[PDB]
Structure formats: C-alpha cells, structure tokens
C-alpha cells in the first residue's frame, strides 16, 4: 500500500579473487608487498626517502628542493621549527602556519578556526585539542619522509594509472594538508597546478558559516583516531579514461535489474556495491572550503578520499576516479545547511586480499546546466551516458563478477539536472556495463514510483538500450529543438511513443 522500495529485492542484488599486488608501469605501490600482513602496519617501500621534484610527481614539503628566499633556505626546516611549539591559544596555531606561508598572511582568514577553538568547544575539549590532538597531528606530519619514502605520481589527464598506498601514509599526508605545508598549491594565478584541486586546508579556517564547526569536528574525529592507533590497511586510487564509447543508437543490450527506494543511503544500504560519488570535475568539490552536499559529506566521513585532491587532475568528459579501501570514521545527521557530526564510527567492513576495506567508490561528475532544456540536447545526453558508462565499466571483468551500482539523484538541485532523465541515463549506462542498479531517491516517494513504473514498462516490452536512447532523441526533436519557452514531460512522452507505435 505504501511500499518503501520497489522492483528486485535488494538481497538478490550482487554485493572476485585478487591477482598478486605488485608495482608495474600502470601501478604505483608505496609499501612492502612481501611484508603485507593482516593487523600489521605496512612497511614503506623504499626503506629510505627518495625525492622527485618535477612536473610528473607530487612536490613534497620535505623535499630538499622545497626552498625559500632568506640565500635559499630549507622550507621543511622552517615547517619543523614553526610546528614544534606549544599551542595554548588559536592565534599560536595561526602564527605557526603563517611562518612558512608569509605571502598569504593578509589573504588567509582564520575566523572559523578561532571561533571553533574559543566559541564552540567547551574548556575540556579545547584542552584535549591543543594538549593531545594538535601535537599528535604535528608528529605524524613531521614523520612524512620516513612514512612516504616513494615519489607519488600525479594522476594526470588521459592517464590510466593506479596508486596503492597505506592508510598510515594517507594520515601523514592529510596532517600536512591541515598544516598547509604542500608547496606550489596556494597561488590564485598558479599555472603548474591550475587544473588540480586545492589540497591545503586553509579555506576550512575562513569565515563564520555555522557548518565550519561541523566540518572541523568531523576532521578532528578522524585525526584523533588515526594518531592514537595507526590504521593497518591499504587504499587504491585509479584514474580511468575510456577511448571507445558505445554507439548508443545501435546498442542491442537489454536493461538490467532495478531496486529503487525513497529510504536509506548509499554508504549504509549500498555495502559491497559500487558506490557513486556525485562529483565535481575537481574531485572533492568544496570539501576543504564551503561545500556541504553529497560529495563533501562522503569526503568528510571517509577522509582518506580527500588525499585524491593531492594527485588527481581535473576530470575530462571521458574520465572517472575509482577509490577502493577508504574507511568510514564518522557518523552524521542531516545534509547541507542541516549537516551535523553525530559520533565516531567503527567501520565493520571486511578487508580484501590487499588489506583494503571492501568499499568501492567512483567519482563521476555530472554537467552543470545554465538552462533546463540544455540537458536534452543529444550531445549533452551522450556526454552523461559516456561519463556514467566510464564510471561503471571494469574492462577485463565479466558480468557475474560485477556488483550492482548503488546510486541516486546524480547532478540534481544546483546543477539543474532533471531527476527522471538522469535516472534513465544511469539505468542505460549500467545496462551497457552489464551491472544491476540500486537507486536511492532520498525521501522522494513519487520519484521512486515513476522510476519503477518506467523501468518495468521498458523491461516487459523488451526494449534495448538502443530503443530507449532513440526515444530520448525523438523527445529532443519533438519537444525541445523548436521550443522557445517543455509542453509535455519525458516519461508521459515515452509511454505515448511506445503505446501508440
Ligand atoms: C532518506 C533521506 N531523506 C533525505 C532528505 C536525505 C538527505 N539527503 C539529501 O537530501 N540529498 C539531496 C537530495 C537529492 N534528491 N533529493 C530528493 C534530495 C542527497 O543527495 C543525499 C544523499 C545521501 S547519500 O546516500 O549519497 N550519502 C552521502 C551524503 C554520501 C555520504 C544521503 C542523504 C541525502 S536522506
């Protein structure tokens, strides 16, 4: 009568044996594979720090080439000198950060950091922060040359490359990003990293949004956890760029199974499934600044995702980022202006043979539409199909070894996407990639019923991916191409076109 889900029961949805982990031309591995053991902290490979200061690698703060005019001085030595002081007041942390960021002393606002420490936290919580958490963060950040001994390659445009690193290595790099130590990543007029996302956390410290203390509580929850007890797993970051896209009009593949619900979440009810991150082209969006929607929330509760911003170049139309192994450290309530940190989370996910949590997330960026009717243009529809297809396709893996896709309203709200069209686009891309779909409508029960009714209508009539794509081309041609102001909606159009043919 008032069903919370529709279609295939979620228990019938798919939730393989891994080859030996080793470095290769397309795979950077920063730990000792021969010494990888369950419950043991991974050993870095190589044993001693090796540096690369070039256009193809991350510029490390501990590099001997990280210099500053004084006679060129060592910025790493200045970083150590600045951070190894007693912090008793928020001004001390501000002053420390600015000693090696002198050019931004008038541009960087620290209001949110000062208000969190002085006006949000109770006396005992502020004391625990500066007596235990901040000194423990400084120590793991300053351990960077002994932890991250191998150069980290940039996951540049058109590269099909993977990075497997430890959760411990990520914690050292993230503590550095908090203390804003990454060089060449700050200038507004920078050229070298203009197409890369921000990594240093300075924009998290600015202004008076009520959401900043919530972001800070979520990040300090993570930092408290990883400095008290070193995490033992690995995380893989894969940049995927497809060369060959399907000729959608000719696709003879039938639709796959659907589970659609207005209750639940991707991270809780999509366990063991490929989880979609409704990404911005610069991965993580405004996680280190003001943004607090779907992507930023996932990046806060699974902070290991944030390090993708260090080495992931802006995604092109034919690219996506696949992150395997991130751990959930926090629980939350609300969304956007109502987001609140709830408590610490003990991730119960099992680990695979590479010691990675069994959590696979794909970042796929939807297009932003200035006008509503722009999304119905064939080129724009083909773009969204190819994007979702790239995120879902696992070249070399057979259908029976592919889990269902756990997704929802991709590119909705601010980006101007039509939920009914985007749902069809994802259903079609999942069909071409031969995966089943688990779709979350986040409280919209009417959308759940419409997606279900459309999917069951097309399935019963045995319409292929090609048949559905051709119907989308007809809708543009009949109702959008000559439209000046649409007159009829997409789903009624589809039912009419099929039932009257
Ligand atoms: C059962 C519910 N109801 C509401 C209102 C909810 C909050 N919420 C919401 O509002 N939106 C906007 C929206 C879009 N379409 N609609 C209709 C709303 C979401 O996108 C959304 C996404 C997720 S999620 O499962 O992706 N998990 C993360 C946030 C990544 C970690 C969770 C909650 C969300 S969850």
Short mmCIF file of C-alpha atoms and ligand atoms in Angstrom, two decimals:
data_model
loop_
_atom_site.label_atom_id
_atom_site.label_comp_id
_atom_site.label_asym_id
_atom_site.label_seq_id
_atom_site.Cartn_x
_atom_site.Cartn_y
_atom_site.Cartn_z
CA UNK A 1 0.00 0.00 0.00
CA UNK A 2 2.83 2.46 0.88
CA UNK A 3 5.91 0.36 -0.21
CA UNK A 4 9.29 1.91 0.79
CA UNK A 5 11.13 0.16 -2.09
CA UNK A 6 10.09 -1.30 -5.47
CA UNK A 7 11.46 -3.79 -8.01
CA UNK A 8 14.04 -6.55 -7.35
CA UNK A 9 14.57 -7.27 -3.60
CA UNK A 10 17.95 -5.82 -2.54
CA UNK A 11 19.07 -9.33 -1.21
CA UNK A 12 19.00 -10.62 -4.87
CA UNK A 13 21.48 -7.82 -5.91
CA UNK A 14 25.27 -8.56 -6.18
CA UNK A 15 27.34 -7.22 -3.19
CA UNK A 16 36.38 -11.93 -7.17
CA UNK A 17 39.83 -13.41 -6.24
CA UNK A 18 42.53 -10.70 -6.48
CA UNK A 19 45.76 -11.12 -8.51
CA UNK A 20 49.08 -10.61 -6.67
CA UNK A 21 49.72 -6.98 -5.71
CA UNK A 22 52.92 -5.62 -7.29
CA UNK A 23 54.23 -2.39 -8.87
CA UNK A 24 54.04 -2.18 -12.69
CA UNK A 25 54.14 0.55 -15.38
CA UNK A 26 50.45 1.44 -14.63
CA UNK A 27 50.52 0.70 -10.87
CA UNK A 28 52.47 2.62 -8.14
CA UNK A 29 52.69 0.57 -4.85
CA UNK A 30 54.31 2.53 -1.94
CA UNK A 31 54.55 -0.33 0.66
CA UNK A 32 56.39 -3.70 1.02
CA UNK A 33 54.08 -6.30 -0.64
CA UNK A 34 56.24 -9.26 0.63
CA UNK A 35 55.66 -7.97 4.23
CA UNK A 36 51.92 -7.15 3.88
CA UNK A 37 50.07 -8.85 6.79
CA UNK A 38 46.58 -8.55 8.34
CA UNK A 39 46.58 -6.44 11.53
CA UNK A 40 50.16 -5.21 10.91
CA UNK A 41 51.15 -1.63 9.94
CA UNK A 42 52.56 -1.76 6.32
CA UNK A 43 56.28 -1.07 5.86
CA UNK A 44 57.10 1.72 3.34
CA UNK A 45 58.98 0.87 0.11
CA UNK A 46 61.76 2.11 -0.34
CA UNK A 47 63.27 1.99 3.21
CA UNK A 48 64.90 5.46 2.85
CA UNK A 49 63.28 8.65 1.43
CA UNK A 50 63.65 9.11 -2.37
CA UNK A 51 62.77 12.52 -3.85
CA UNK A 52 61.33 13.68 -7.21
CA UNK A 53 60.81 17.43 -7.76
CA UNK A 54 59.35 17.54 -11.31
CA UNK A 55 56.15 18.13 -13.43
CA UNK A 56 55.06 14.43 -13.14
CA UNK A 57 55.13 13.99 -9.33
CA UNK A 58 53.67 15.49 -6.12
CA UNK A 59 56.05 18.23 -4.83
CA UNK A 60 56.67 17.02 -1.27
CA UNK A 61 57.06 19.55 1.60
CA UNK A 62 60.06 17.53 2.93
CA UNK A 63 61.94 17.80 -0.42
CA UNK A 64 65.44 19.36 -0.31
CA UNK A 65 64.26 21.47 -3.33
CA UNK A 66 61.44 22.98 -1.17
CA UNK A 67 63.25 26.30 -0.72
CA UNK A 68 62.50 29.90 0.31
CA UNK A 69 64.48 33.22 -0.11
CA UNK A 70 66.14 34.37 3.18
CA UNK A 71 70.45 32.67 0.28
CA UNK A 72 67.79 29.96 -0.28
CA UNK A 73 66.68 28.30 2.97
CA UNK A 74 65.03 24.95 3.69
CA UNK A 75 61.21 25.35 3.97
CA UNK A 76 60.98 21.89 5.66
CA UNK A 77 63.32 23.06 8.47
CA UNK A 78 61.17 26.20 8.88
CA UNK A 79 58.00 23.93 8.96
CA UNK A 80 59.59 21.81 11.77
CA UNK A 81 60.64 24.95 13.72
CA UNK A 82 57.17 26.56 13.37
CA UNK A 83 55.10 23.43 14.28
CA UNK A 84 57.23 22.18 17.25
CA UNK A 85 55.94 24.87 19.64
CA UNK A 86 53.33 24.69 22.41
CA UNK A 87 49.89 25.78 21.16
CA UNK A 88 47.74 27.12 24.02
CA UNK A 89 45.56 29.62 22.05
CA UNK A 90 44.20 29.55 18.40
CA UNK A 91 46.48 32.54 17.46
CA UNK A 92 49.53 30.26 18.14
CA UNK A 93 48.35 27.75 15.50
CA UNK A 94 47.55 30.59 13.02
CA UNK A 95 51.05 32.18 13.61
CA UNK A 96 52.76 28.72 13.17
CA UNK A 97 51.01 28.04 9.80
CA UNK A 98 51.82 31.57 8.51
CA UNK A 99 55.59 31.36 9.26
CA UNK A 100 56.03 29.20 6.11
CA UNK A 101 53.15 30.93 4.21
CA UNK A 102 54.27 34.62 4.68
CA UNK A 103 52.77 35.67 1.24
CA UNK A 104 49.23 34.69 2.47
CA UNK A 105 49.40 36.35 5.94
CA UNK A 106 46.95 39.06 4.76
CA UNK A 107 44.88 36.77 2.42
CA UNK A 108 44.18 33.80 4.72
CA UNK A 109 41.31 34.20 7.14
CA UNK A 110 41.38 32.04 10.34
CA UNK A 111 37.99 33.18 11.90
CA UNK A 112 36.40 29.67 11.73
CA UNK A 113 39.42 28.06 13.46
CA UNK A 114 39.48 30.76 16.22
CA UNK A 115 35.65 30.54 16.69
CA UNK A 116 35.73 26.69 16.83
CA UNK A 117 38.52 26.64 19.48
CA UNK A 118 37.24 29.64 21.52
CA UNK A 119 33.46 29.88 20.91
CA UNK A 120 32.20 26.35 20.04
CA UNK A 121 34.35 23.92 22.12
CA UNK A 122 33.94 23.55 25.90
CA UNK A 123 37.07 24.18 28.06
CA UNK A 124 37.99 20.41 28.38
CA UNK A 125 37.50 19.77 24.59
CA UNK A 126 39.71 22.78 23.64
CA UNK A 127 42.33 21.46 26.17
CA UNK A 128 42.25 17.95 24.65
CA UNK A 129 42.67 19.57 21.18
CA UNK A 130 45.84 21.57 21.94
CA UNK A 131 47.35 19.24 24.56
CA UNK A 132 46.77 15.93 22.68
CA UNK A 133 45.23 16.10 19.11
CA UNK A 134 47.27 19.05 17.53
CA UNK A 135 50.72 17.86 18.90
CA UNK A 136 49.89 14.26 17.71
CA UNK A 137 48.98 15.71 14.24
CA UNK A 138 52.31 17.67 14.10
CA UNK A 139 54.29 14.48 14.92
CA UNK A 140 52.66 12.39 12.16
CA UNK A 141 53.02 15.32 9.65
CA UNK A 142 56.76 15.70 10.52
CA UNK A 143 57.24 11.90 10.11
CA UNK A 144 56.41 12.30 6.35
CA UNK A 145 59.97 11.50 5.00
CA UNK A 146 60.01 8.18 6.96
CA UNK A 147 56.40 7.26 6.03
CA UNK A 148 56.08 8.38 2.34
CA UNK A 149 59.51 7.35 1.04
CA UNK A 150 58.41 6.81 -2.58
CA UNK A 151 57.59 9.59 -5.08
CA UNK A 152 53.81 9.90 -5.71
CA UNK A 153 52.93 10.26 -9.41
CA UNK A 154 50.26 12.70 -10.49
CA UNK A 155 47.11 11.04 -11.91
CA UNK A 156 47.17 13.42 -14.92
CA UNK A 157 44.58 13.77 -17.73
CA UNK A 158 44.32 10.70 -20.09
CA UNK A 159 46.42 8.54 -17.73
CA UNK A 160 45.11 5.05 -16.89
CA UNK A 161 47.13 4.59 -13.71
CA UNK A 162 46.68 3.32 -10.12
CA UNK A 163 48.26 4.27 -6.75
CA UNK A 164 48.11 1.80 -3.82
CA UNK A 165 49.31 3.36 -0.53
CA UNK A 166 48.74 2.68 3.16
CA UNK A 167 46.08 4.37 5.38
CA UNK A 168 49.03 5.40 7.65
CA UNK A 169 50.76 7.15 4.64
CA UNK A 170 47.43 8.99 3.99
CA UNK A 171 47.19 10.19 7.61
CA UNK A 172 50.75 11.73 7.38
CA UNK A 173 49.90 13.49 4.08
CA UNK A 174 46.46 14.72 5.42
CA UNK A 175 48.09 16.14 8.65
CA UNK A 176 50.46 18.07 6.27
CA UNK A 177 47.37 19.33 4.24
CA UNK A 178 45.82 20.52 7.56
CA UNK A 179 49.02 22.45 8.45
CA UNK A 180 49.07 23.84 4.81
CA UNK A 181 52.64 22.55 4.04
CA UNK A 182 52.25 21.46 0.39
CA UNK A 183 54.30 23.83 -1.80
CA UNK A 184 53.09 25.41 -5.11
CA UNK A 185 49.45 24.65 -4.25
CA UNK A 186 48.41 28.10 -2.95
CA UNK A 187 48.65 30.82 -5.65
CA UNK A 188 45.42 32.05 -7.36
CA UNK A 189 47.49 32.66 -10.56
CA UNK A 190 49.46 29.33 -10.38
CA UNK A 191 49.93 27.54 -13.74
CA UNK A 192 51.59 24.22 -12.76
CA UNK A 193 48.63 23.10 -10.60
CA UNK A 194 45.81 25.32 -12.03
CA UNK A 195 43.95 22.17 -13.24
CA UNK A 196 44.37 20.38 -9.83
CA UNK A 197 42.04 20.73 -6.79
CA UNK A 198 43.07 22.61 -3.61
CA UNK A 199 44.82 20.34 -1.08
CA UNK A 200 45.98 22.72 1.78
CA UNK A 201 43.12 23.16 4.34
CA UNK A 202 43.30 27.00 4.78
CA UNK A 203 39.79 27.68 3.35
CA UNK A 204 38.37 25.43 6.13
CA UNK A 205 39.60 28.09 8.60
CA UNK A 206 37.81 31.08 7.00
CA UNK A 207 34.53 32.91 7.78
CA UNK A 208 31.56 32.29 10.12
CA UNK A 209 29.39 29.60 8.47
CA UNK A 210 27.62 27.51 11.18
CA UNK A 211 28.72 24.45 9.11
CA UNK A 212 32.50 25.01 9.71
CA UNK A 213 32.47 23.68 13.34
CA UNK A 214 30.68 20.56 11.96
CA UNK A 215 33.38 20.05 9.24
CA UNK A 216 36.14 20.61 11.90
CA UNK A 217 34.55 18.12 14.37
CA UNK A 218 34.35 15.52 11.57
CA UNK A 219 38.04 16.03 10.58
CA UNK A 220 39.38 16.15 14.19
CA UNK A 221 37.40 12.90 14.85
CA UNK A 222 39.45 11.27 12.03
CA UNK A 223 42.77 12.85 13.19
CA UNK A 224 42.21 11.77 16.82
CA UNK A 225 41.50 8.14 15.64
CA UNK A 226 44.48 7.72 13.23
CA UNK A 227 47.10 9.34 15.59
CA UNK A 228 46.00 7.31 18.70
CA UNK A 229 46.12 3.95 16.79
CA UNK A 230 47.83 3.66 13.35
CA UNK A 231 45.48 2.21 10.67
CA UNK A 232 46.72 -1.06 9.10
CA UNK A 233 45.03 -1.20 5.67
CA UNK A 234 45.69 -0.03 2.08
CA UNK A 235 43.74 2.24 -0.30
CA UNK A 236 43.86 2.16 -4.17
CA UNK A 237 43.21 5.32 -6.34
CA UNK A 238 42.60 4.55 -10.06
CA UNK A 239 42.22 7.09 -12.83
CA UNK A 240 40.19 5.54 -15.72
CA UNK A 241 39.91 7.07 -19.22
CA UNK A 242 37.92 5.25 -21.94
CA UNK A 243 38.95 5.58 -25.60
CA UNK A 244 35.97 3.61 -27.09
CA UNK A 245 32.39 4.60 -26.24
CA UNK A 246 29.29 2.68 -27.39
CA UNK A 247 27.24 3.80 -30.42
CA UNK A 248 24.14 4.12 -28.15
CA UNK A 249 21.54 4.15 -31.05
CA UNK A 250 22.80 0.62 -32.03
CA UNK A 251 23.10 -0.93 -28.50
CA UNK A 252 21.20 -4.27 -28.51
CA UNK A 253 21.75 -4.97 -24.78
CA UNK A 254 18.59 -5.33 -22.66
CA UNK A 255 18.03 -3.41 -19.38
CA UNK A 256 19.24 -4.92 -16.10
CA UNK A 257 17.53 -5.33 -12.70
CA UNK A 258 16.38 -2.38 -10.52
CA UNK A 259 15.87 -1.82 -6.79
CA UNK A 260 14.53 1.72 -6.17
CA UNK A 261 13.78 3.17 -2.68
CA UNK A 262 12.94 6.54 -1.03
CA UNK A 263 14.54 5.37 2.28
CA UNK A 264 18.20 4.58 3.11
CA UNK A 265 21.64 5.79 1.98
CA UNK A 266 24.40 4.72 -0.44
CA UNK A 267 27.05 4.16 2.36
CA UNK A 268 24.69 2.19 4.73
CA UNK A 269 22.41 0.26 2.29
CA UNK A 270 24.91 0.01 -0.61
CA UNK A 271 27.57 -2.06 1.19
CA UNK A 272 29.63 -4.30 -1.11
CA UNK A 273 28.24 -2.40 -4.15
CA UNK A 274 29.94 0.14 -6.46
CA UNK A 275 29.06 3.43 -4.63
CA UNK A 276 28.58 6.61 -6.68
CA UNK A 277 30.08 9.92 -5.59
CA UNK A 278 28.10 12.81 -7.33
CA UNK A 279 31.39 14.53 -8.07
CA UNK A 280 32.62 17.93 -9.30
CA UNK A 281 35.29 17.80 -12.09
CA UNK A 282 37.82 18.89 -9.37
CA UNK A 283 37.32 15.78 -7.08
CA UNK A 284 36.00 16.56 -3.60
CA UNK A 285 34.33 19.83 -4.66
CA UNK A 286 34.34 22.30 -1.78
CA UNK A 287 35.28 19.77 0.99
CA UNK A 288 38.27 21.98 2.08
CA UNK A 289 36.15 25.17 1.80
CA UNK A 290 32.36 25.85 1.90
CA UNK A 291 30.54 22.94 0.10
CA UNK A 292 28.48 20.52 2.21
CA UNK A 293 26.33 18.43 -0.20
CA UNK A 294 26.63 14.67 -1.27
CA UNK A 295 30.34 14.63 -2.33
CA UNK A 296 31.76 16.80 0.50
CA UNK A 297 29.89 14.77 3.15
CA UNK A 298 31.40 11.48 1.87
CA UNK A 299 34.86 13.13 1.83
CA UNK A 300 34.42 14.20 5.47
CA UNK A 301 33.18 10.86 6.88
CA UNK A 302 35.76 8.94 4.75
CA UNK A 303 38.66 11.49 4.96
CA UNK A 304 41.14 9.21 3.07
CA UNK A 305 39.15 10.28 -0.08
CA UNK A 306 40.47 13.89 0.47
CA UNK A 307 44.10 12.82 -0.45
CA UNK A 308 42.85 12.20 -4.05
CA UNK A 309 42.97 16.08 -4.35
CA UNK A 310 46.78 15.96 -3.90
CA UNK A 311 47.39 13.98 -7.12
CA UNK A 312 44.11 13.87 -9.18
CA UNK A 313 43.95 16.33 -12.11
CA UNK A 314 40.54 17.77 -13.14
CA UNK A 315 38.44 15.02 -14.79
CA UNK A 316 37.83 15.27 -18.54
CA UNK A 317 34.45 14.16 -20.10
CA UNK A 318 35.73 10.59 -20.71
CA UNK A 319 37.30 10.05 -17.22
CA UNK A 320 36.45 8.99 -13.66
CA UNK A 321 38.28 8.19 -10.38
CA UNK A 322 37.78 4.80 -8.63
CA UNK A 323 38.74 4.68 -4.91
CA UNK A 324 38.94 1.30 -3.19
CA UNK A 325 39.51 0.82 0.55
CA UNK A 326 38.52 4.08 2.28
CA UNK A 327 37.25 3.74 5.83
CA UNK A 328 34.25 5.45 7.44
CA UNK A 329 35.45 7.26 10.61
CA UNK A 330 32.30 9.36 11.38
CA UNK A 331 28.52 9.21 11.59
CA UNK A 332 26.36 12.22 10.73
CA UNK A 333 22.73 13.53 10.56
CA UNK A 334 21.20 15.99 8.10
CA UNK A 335 22.51 17.32 4.80
CA UNK A 336 23.88 20.68 3.60
CA UNK A 337 22.68 23.50 5.97
CA UNK A 338 21.45 20.82 8.50
CA UNK A 339 24.61 18.63 8.43
CA UNK A 340 25.90 17.70 11.88
CA UNK A 341 28.66 15.38 13.08
CA UNK A 342 26.96 12.68 15.27
CA UNK A 343 29.71 10.46 16.79
CA UNK A 344 32.72 8.24 15.94
CA UNK A 345 32.12 5.25 13.59
CA UNK A 346 33.78 1.81 13.94
CA UNK A 347 33.92 0.55 10.34
CA UNK A 348 32.98 -3.16 10.27
CA UNK A 349 33.77 -3.68 6.54
CA UNK A 350 35.89 -6.74 5.82
CA UNK A 351 39.26 -6.33 4.04
CA UNK A 352 40.16 -7.99 0.72
CA UNK A 353 43.50 -9.81 -0.08
CA UNK A 354 45.28 -6.41 -0.47
CA UNK A 355 44.15 -5.36 3.06
CA UNK A 356 41.70 -2.81 1.56
CA UNK A 357 38.26 -2.23 3.20
CA UNK A 358 35.62 -3.76 0.83
CA UNK A 359 34.25 -0.28 -0.15
CA UNK A 360 34.48 0.83 -3.79
CA UNK A 361 33.59 4.43 -4.63
CA UNK A 362 33.54 6.00 -8.11
CA UNK A 363 33.67 9.82 -8.67
CA UNK A 364 31.60 10.79 -11.79
CA UNK A 365 30.87 14.44 -12.48
CA UNK A 366 27.53 15.45 -13.93
CA UNK A 367 27.29 18.55 -16.17
CA UNK A 368 26.02 21.89 -14.82
CA UNK A 369 23.14 23.26 -16.98
CA UNK A 370 22.66 27.10 -17.24
CA UNK A 371 19.24 26.40 -18.82
CA UNK A 372 16.97 23.41 -18.06
CA UNK A 373 16.38 22.30 -21.71
CA UNK A 374 20.17 22.15 -22.43
CA UNK A 375 20.34 18.58 -20.93
CA UNK A 376 18.00 17.17 -23.64
CA UNK A 377 20.47 18.11 -26.47
CA UNK A 378 21.80 14.79 -27.99
CA UNK A 379 25.47 15.77 -27.39
CA UNK A 380 24.64 16.55 -23.69
CA UNK A 381 22.73 13.23 -23.21
CA UNK A 382 25.54 11.24 -24.95
CA UNK A 383 28.07 13.02 -22.63
CA UNK A 384 26.18 11.88 -19.43
CA UNK A 385 25.76 8.33 -20.78
CA UNK A 386 29.54 8.03 -21.57
CA UNK A 387 30.52 9.55 -18.19
CA UNK A 388 28.34 7.07 -16.17
CA UNK A 389 29.46 4.24 -18.52
CA UNK A 390 33.14 5.01 -17.79
CA UNK A 391 32.47 5.00 -14.01
CA UNK A 392 30.62 1.63 -14.25
CA UNK A 393 32.76 -0.29 -16.77
CA UNK A 394 35.50 -2.61 -15.46
CA UNK A 395 37.40 -3.65 -18.64
CA UNK A 396 38.53 -7.29 -18.35
CA UNK A 397 35.96 -8.25 -15.64
CA UNK A 398 32.97 -10.49 -16.62
CA UNK A 399 29.29 -9.63 -15.74
CA UNK A 400 28.91 -12.28 -12.97
CA UNK A 401 31.88 -10.73 -11.06
CA UNK A 402 30.41 -7.17 -11.16
CA UNK A 403 28.45 -5.91 -8.15
CA UNK A 404 25.29 -3.73 -8.50
CA UNK A 405 25.72 0.11 -8.79
CA UNK A 406 24.40 1.99 -5.66
CA UNK A 407 23.36 5.48 -6.87
CA UNK A 408 20.65 8.16 -6.70
CA UNK A 409 19.74 11.65 -7.99
CA UNK A 410 23.09 12.38 -9.79
CA UNK A 411 23.68 16.06 -10.73
CA UNK A 412 20.39 17.35 -9.22
CA UNK A 413 19.48 20.63 -7.47
CA UNK A 414 22.13 23.35 -8.11
CA UNK A 415 23.48 21.70 -11.33
CA UNK A 416 19.95 21.86 -12.90
CA UNK A 417 19.61 18.17 -13.76
CA UNK A 418 16.16 16.58 -14.36
CA UNK A 419 15.86 13.57 -11.96
CA UNK A 420 13.71 11.48 -14.37
CA UNK A 421 16.15 11.87 -17.32
CA UNK A 422 19.26 11.26 -15.12
CA UNK A 423 17.68 8.13 -13.67
CA UNK A 424 17.15 6.75 -17.23
CA UNK A 425 20.71 7.73 -18.29
CA UNK A 426 22.20 5.79 -15.33
CA UNK A 427 19.92 2.78 -15.98
CA UNK A 428 21.12 2.74 -19.65
CA UNK A 429 24.85 3.09 -18.75
CA UNK A 430 24.55 0.32 -16.11
CA UNK A 431 22.86 -1.89 -18.78
CA UNK A 432 25.75 -1.33 -21.29
CA UNK A 433 28.28 -2.05 -18.46
CA UNK A 434 26.12 -5.16 -17.55
CA UNK A 435 25.50 -4.20 -13.87
CA UNK A 436 22.21 -4.10 -11.85
CA UNK A 437 21.04 -0.76 -10.28
CA UNK A 438 20.17 0.11 -6.66
CA UNK A 439 18.62 3.64 -6.75
CA UNK A 440 18.08 5.93 -3.70
CA UNK A 441 15.55 8.81 -4.08
CA UNK A 442 16.26 10.43 -0.63
CA UNK A 443 12.66 10.92 0.58
CA UNK A 444 11.07 11.47 -2.84
CA UNK A 445 8.48 8.61 -2.88
CA UNK A 446 6.83 9.90 -6.14
CA UNK A 447 10.22 9.72 -7.99
CA UNK A 448 10.70 6.12 -6.71
CA UNK A 449 7.26 5.11 -8.17
CA UNK A 450 7.94 6.90 -11.56
CA UNK A 451 11.43 5.32 -11.98
CA UNK A 452 9.99 1.87 -11.08
CA UNK A 453 6.94 2.21 -13.44
CA UNK A 454 9.18 3.38 -16.31
CA UNK A 455 11.76 0.58 -15.79
CA UNK A 456 9.06 -2.17 -15.58
CA UNK A 457 7.28 -0.71 -18.72
CA UNK A 458 10.51 -0.82 -20.85
CA UNK A 459 11.56 -4.29 -19.46
CA UNK A 460 8.12 -6.00 -20.14
CA UNK A 461 8.24 -4.62 -23.70
CA UNK A 462 11.88 -5.92 -24.09
CA UNK A 463 13.25 -2.52 -25.24
CA UNK A 464 17.06 -2.45 -25.64
CA UNK A 465 19.50 0.40 -24.66
CA UNK A 466 19.29 1.50 -28.36
CA UNK A 467 15.45 1.57 -28.39
CA UNK A 468 15.43 3.78 -25.21
CA UNK A 469 18.26 6.07 -26.47
CA UNK A 470 16.32 6.59 -29.79
CA UNK A 471 13.19 7.57 -27.73
CA UNK A 472 15.32 10.22 -25.96
CA UNK A 473 16.44 11.58 -29.42
CA UNK A 474 12.75 11.78 -30.50
CA UNK A 475 11.80 13.70 -27.29
CA UNK A 476 14.52 16.34 -28.04
CA UNK A 477 13.35 16.58 -31.64
CA UNK A 478 9.59 16.77 -30.93
CA UNK A 479 9.57 18.85 -27.70
CA UNK A 480 12.98 20.68 -27.23
CA UNK A 481 14.63 21.54 -30.65
CA UNK A 482 11.88 24.05 -31.68
CA UNK A 483 10.83 25.04 -28.08
CA UNK A 484 11.24 28.82 -27.38
CA UNK A 485 9.71 28.94 -23.82
CA UNK A 486 8.59 21.95 -22.26
CA UNK A 487 4.93 21.29 -23.25
CA UNK A 488 4.94 17.54 -22.34
CA UNK A 489 7.21 15.71 -19.84
CA UNK A 490 9.72 12.94 -20.81
CA UNK A 491 8.06 9.90 -19.12
CA UNK A 492 4.48 10.64 -20.45
CA UNK A 493 6.20 11.18 -23.89
CA UNK A 494 7.89 7.73 -23.68
CA UNK A 495 4.67 5.85 -22.64
CA UNK A 496 2.79 7.58 -25.53
CA UNK A 497 5.52 6.93 -28.17
CA UNK A 498 5.72 3.19 -27.31
CA UNK A 499 1.95 2.53 -26.69
CA UNK A 500 0.90 4.29 -29.97
CA UNK A 501 3.60 2.64 -32.17
C1 LIG B 1 16.13 9.39 3.35
C2 LIG B 1 16.69 10.76 3.19
N1 LIG B 1 15.99 11.86 3.06
C3 LIG B 1 16.79 12.97 2.92
C4 LIG B 1 16.13 14.31 2.77
C5 LIG B 1 18.14 12.72 2.93
C6 LIG B 1 19.28 13.74 2.83
N2 LIG B 1 19.96 13.73 1.53
C7 LIG B 1 19.53 14.65 0.59
O1 LIG B 1 18.70 15.50 0.87
N3 LIG B 1 20.14 14.63 -0.65
C8 LIG B 1 19.73 15.64 -1.62
C9 LIG B 1 18.57 15.17 -2.45
C10 LIG B 1 18.57 14.78 -3.80
N4 LIG B 1 17.36 14.42 -4.20
N5 LIG B 1 16.58 14.60 -3.11
C11 LIG B 1 15.15 14.31 -3.18
C12 LIG B 1 17.28 15.05 -2.06
C13 LIG B 1 21.11 13.70 -1.07
O2 LIG B 1 21.57 13.76 -2.20
C14 LIG B 1 21.50 12.71 -0.06
C15 LIG B 1 22.47 11.74 -0.38
C16 LIG B 1 22.84 10.79 0.59
S1 LIG B 1 24.00 9.53 0.19
O3 LIG B 1 23.34 8.28 0.44
O4 LIG B 1 24.55 9.79 -1.10
N6 LIG B 1 25.18 9.59 1.30
C17 LIG B 1 26.22 10.65 1.45
C18 LIG B 1 25.68 12.03 1.77
C19 LIG B 1 27.43 10.49 0.58
C20 LIG B 1 27.52 10.21 2.06
C21 LIG B 1 22.29 10.84 1.88
C22 LIG B 1 21.37 11.80 2.18
C23 LIG B 1 20.93 12.74 1.23
S2 LIG B 1 18.42 11.01 3.12
#
